[PDB]
Amino acid sequence: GHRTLASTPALWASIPCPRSELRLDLVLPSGQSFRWREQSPAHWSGVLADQVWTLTQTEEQLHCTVYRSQASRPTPDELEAVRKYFQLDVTLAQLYHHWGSVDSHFQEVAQKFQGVRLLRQDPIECLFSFICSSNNNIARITGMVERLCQAFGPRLIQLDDVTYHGFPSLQALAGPEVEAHLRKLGLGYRARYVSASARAILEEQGGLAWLQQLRESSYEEAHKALCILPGVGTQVADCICLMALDKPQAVPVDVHMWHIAQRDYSWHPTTSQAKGPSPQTNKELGNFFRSLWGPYAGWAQAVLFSADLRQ
Amino acid sequence: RKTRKESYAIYVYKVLKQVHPDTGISSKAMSIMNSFVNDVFERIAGEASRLAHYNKRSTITSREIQTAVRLLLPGELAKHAVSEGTKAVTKYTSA
Amino acid sequence: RKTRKESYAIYVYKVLKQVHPDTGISSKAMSIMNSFVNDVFERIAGEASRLAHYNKRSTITSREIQTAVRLLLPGELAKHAVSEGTKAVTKYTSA
Amino acid sequence: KTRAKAKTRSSRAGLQFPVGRVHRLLRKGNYAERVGAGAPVYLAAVLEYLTAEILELAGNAARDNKKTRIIPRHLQLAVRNDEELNKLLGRVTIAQGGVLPNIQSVLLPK
Amino acid sequence: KTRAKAKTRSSRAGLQFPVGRVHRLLRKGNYAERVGAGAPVYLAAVLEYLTAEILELAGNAARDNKKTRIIPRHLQLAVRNDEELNKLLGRVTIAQGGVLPNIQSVLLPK
Amino acid sequence: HRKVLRDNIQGITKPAIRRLARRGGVKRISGLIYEETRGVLKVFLENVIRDAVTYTEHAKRKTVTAMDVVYALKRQGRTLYGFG
Amino acid sequence: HRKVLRDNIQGITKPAIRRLARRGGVKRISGLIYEETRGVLKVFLENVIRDAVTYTEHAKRKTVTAMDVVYALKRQGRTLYGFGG
Amino acid sequence: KPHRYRPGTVALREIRRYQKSTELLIRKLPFQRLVREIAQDFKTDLRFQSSAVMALQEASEAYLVALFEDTNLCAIHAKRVTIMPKDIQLARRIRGER
Amino acid sequence: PHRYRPGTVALREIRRYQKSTELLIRKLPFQRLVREIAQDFKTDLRFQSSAVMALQEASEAYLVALFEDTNLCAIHAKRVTIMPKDIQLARRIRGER
DNA sequence: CACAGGATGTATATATCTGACACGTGCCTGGAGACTAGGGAGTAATCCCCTTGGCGGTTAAAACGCGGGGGACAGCGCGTACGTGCGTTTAAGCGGTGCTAGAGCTGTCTACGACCAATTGAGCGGCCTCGGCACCGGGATTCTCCAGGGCGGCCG
DNA sequence: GGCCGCCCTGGAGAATCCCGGTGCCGAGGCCGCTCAATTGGTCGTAGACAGCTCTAGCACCGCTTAAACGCACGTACGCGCTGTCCCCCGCGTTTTAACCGCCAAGGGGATTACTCCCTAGTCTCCAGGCACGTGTCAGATATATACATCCTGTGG
């Protein structure tokens, strides 16, 4: 079972993370990841880098524990990796103050919201998690990702309810018959969007090296390269750039964001001649958000999305 | 010398000769005719007994037989049977 | 004052009280049960009469009733009815 | 004792079927306590008419088959081809009678 | 006069249905010339058993329907839910009894 | 006091036949069923009532009792319980 | 001689059932018809023979006469002509 | 947008309601008039007990319900859910009424 | 070779066996079947020849009538081949099951 | 796809048994004559109950209409299953014999059931009377159905 | 720029179930009382039982051959799928006639006497039909065709 605060006192790792700068219950279940589940209050658990990380939030520190195999005191490299994953080097207090100064609506929203941060996931893991994240509820996508990990991931241990496995390897997803096998699992048409987004990585784009080289590439070139892959629309490409390529300028735009804009910001497509989901409307909304907030508008977009879900 | 078994052989033969003067009957056809006559007799007699019991009478008369015939025989068969029975009863009472 | 009519109401009620002491009956249900008893009586009596006529007997005895019950009631109903009838006849003769 | 000449009750009614035999059968069939005088006459007349009708139809059927003797097949044909007799004998099986020639229109070739 | 105490034939055989009434009905029903002594007892026992069985099933149905009086619907349920009773009463229509709940599987939504 | 009735077969309305079919367990009914059904009903009565009238003629009565209908149904093998 | 007969239902051969169907007007017969027909025939014969043997036992006889079969058929509403009266 | 049930669910509800009930389905007066009209052809100036008409109505309803059950079985046999006059004719012919 | 088409011989057999009147089931197998069935009810039974003939006549008539009903049921379903479901439907409607 | 010819049943003609049916005969048992008696049923008079007929208010149910969605019906393809024909094998069919279990009739007589006079109590009918059931009101639960959900590629 | 691919929750709305008070009328119990069930005999015959006869059923055998059985080949057909279109269901609105209660009249169903004639019951007598022989001719069998029918290639 998942470790509780009174289970293993000597199997914890504490990092400086104040409550104001981060809210675990407002980020992980807000659709930013589909591999974390809640069993006990203020607890989350997900498999990254073939190791199961369980996270809890205290008043001013963040506690983490690791499942692999029978060792404690996780090495500092894991702490550095999780700090990069959580962007602990970036302070959101200044961004919140600037956003409140430029617009009072964010401050009104952030009156009770303080600590909706962003993640830095593995590009392969984030891409394959968000491939099947189109036109579905968060729970359905999370279950889909869990079933995919069970089917194509190396198992680690059964945590008294369900086995935990590492993320499926890229070689096992580029093979034939994968589409039908995943449709048997119940992925729908998105299963095909997985296959066309796997083989082309190794057979048409240049393998993992091409994908990893985009972490230091330009914004537009990386966005276009991600959009080249089948099934990768503008929204998922922006999400991957923001949460897997370290691109704060990427602002996801969707139905929740559009509803927020039309109900609180009263923004309308000026150049565009319609109000439906289109790349031109997405680009206009992104430009408007960047002009109104700045280069780090993705964090404010995530704050609004988390606020929209909890309302 | 055994127990004599009665049947309607002679009467069916006489009726056949009256209808078709130059036509015979096989033994199997005669047995079928015997069974048919016995079955119709049983049906009419049972219906007459039911009619007598329902009306709290203790006798079976021509009226009961006529009602039983009208109940059992369908269509023009009932009409012709009633006509034949009425003619026979009138002739019997006259002589 | 009128002519009194007989029915199986009291006996059906006694049997019902023996089976289900805390259950009642309706007038329509009592009439239906009376019709059922009359129908079964008529069936068994007619079958026994046919059996007596076929075997050239002139008396309906418990043997004819048992044969009629076997011919009419299907399955375990016949077995249990025969058992009950045999028990009743044995008790009647003993006392 | 020379009484009057005995005349059968069938002769009095002009019938061929035995009035006395039917009277005895009614009296011995436990149908009722009493049997009227005209009840045997009526029953004999009805039986004679039914036998005459069925025999006429059977003889016509046999003549149509170029035979001069009624077999069970002719009786079956006579009963089934006549509507009223068929209704009367709907639940009756005639031994060695066969069935009417009847092939459904769907099964025939076209 | 002082005879022995009158003991009914129903009590002698341990039955509830009337032996004397069944004896009279057989005697006056014109079923046979003579009626035996044990035939009314046997017939009464058979009728009592059948009534007891059908009433037990009807009372069970009434209890399952949360009622303390047996109505025609309960009798219909009892008769049609038992194979032997249904076979015995196959061509019997019970007044105000309705029909068993039975919807074919093809018609149900899927 | 002379009253002659005519065209009363239409008194068995379409909803009545639909209710009977639903009691029987029918989900969809064709539009041509109803007329057909009416005819069937008539034929049924044209048998049973006829037999009943015959019994009424034998008793020298001018009214049709319930027992007459019960006997008429018993002739056709349709024993009815609940009317005597 | 005490002999026991078993598995005689197969004596109702496929051609016999085929001829019976042909008399009824059947043009094509499925292969599974034969077993169902054998079952139906066995049920019918069991029903008739039970009544016939009941009649025979009532008469204290050990021979099943034709009139017993006729009475058994008459009980089931299948009156048969040509075997007595 | 008005709330409309899909075709079929109301039919199943009616089936359940009517099979749960025991009351007569045909109206009393039309059936009584039909009975009197039919009886006129057999004997003029007839009279009926109320119980006689009730018995006729119950017998007719039972017969029609059984016929409709057989018709439904025939319709299902033909891979259909709608009963048609051919189904009634087939059921009657199998039962021997025609 | 002069093979007839699939079904003309069937119609010829229909005509031949509807014109004829003889028993269609062999007598000895039917007699053995009757004796086997009767063994279950009472041991050491004897049968008259007329009894077995009457049983065979009744059996053949019942089977022919059931086959006519089955043929009607099969034609109702727009088919010319009889199947066990047709027999089941016919017996259900007739009231035998 | 219409048609003439080849091949296969099929009905028609004719001789030739043969055994099943139609006719003649003896007799005996079941039907007819004649007479009596007693009860079942036909007929008249009466009570009164149940049916028929009329009427008006209420409103539940039937009739009409419209939209549409689901089912009926026709067409098409295909692949297994069943018809058809031929060679083998099986055991049904026929007649012949032999034995005997059991159906079938007969004679005794005994116990069982019909019938009758005398009682008498069980059960039918009439009358309370109260409790089970029909019903209404209101709320909770359940069942059905459609719109919208961090969308995307496409043919208009 | 709608739009459907695939489908999966979440409400909205309607139907149904549950709980409790109301009230009402019919099921159940009681009570007198009349007729049918029970007692106690008596007598007549129905059938149970023993015995004998002789019929038909059962068993076996040989041996002819019709029929069943197995197998191979081909094609008619059942079955699944798709598309169209039409008609039956669901729902709302308007009409109508069923239903309920009331009243009154009288038709005839049911009960009771009274009588009479019609059928069961006996005895006697005789002839109609049943069992038994027996002859002969209608039908079954076999052979020999003349024609109807089915199936297929060649020809256009």
Numbering used by the authors:
A (entry chain K): 12 to 79, 83 to 325
B (entry chain D), C (entry chain H): 27 to 121
D (entry chain C), E (entry chain G): 9 to 118
F (entry chain B): 18 to 101
G (entry chain F): 18 to 102
H (entry chain A): 37 to 134
I (entry chain E): 38 to 134
Authors' own words:
Human OGG1 contains an AlkA_N-like domain and a helix-hairpin-helix (HhH-GPD) motif55.
OGG1 prefers to bind at these sites over the internal SHL-5 and +6 sites, therefore, we decided to perform a focused 3D classification in the OGG1-bound DNA entry region and derived an EM map at 3.2 Å average resolution. In this map, the nucleosome region including the DNA is resolved at high resolution, but the OGG1 is only at a low resolution of 5–7 Å. We found that the OGG1-bound DNA region at the nucleosomal entry site is bent, as compared with a free nucleosome structure in which DNA protrudes straightly outward. Our above-described OGG1–nucleosome structure revealing a flipped normal G at the nucleosome entry site was determined in the absence of a specific crosslinker. However, the nonspecific protein-DNA crosslinker formaldehyde was used to stabilize the OGG1–nucleosome complexes. The observed OGG1 preference for the nucleosome entry/exit sites is likely a result of the enzyme getting stuck at these DNA ends. The DNA entry/exit sites of an in vitro reconstituted single nucleosome resemble double-strand DNA breaks (DSB).
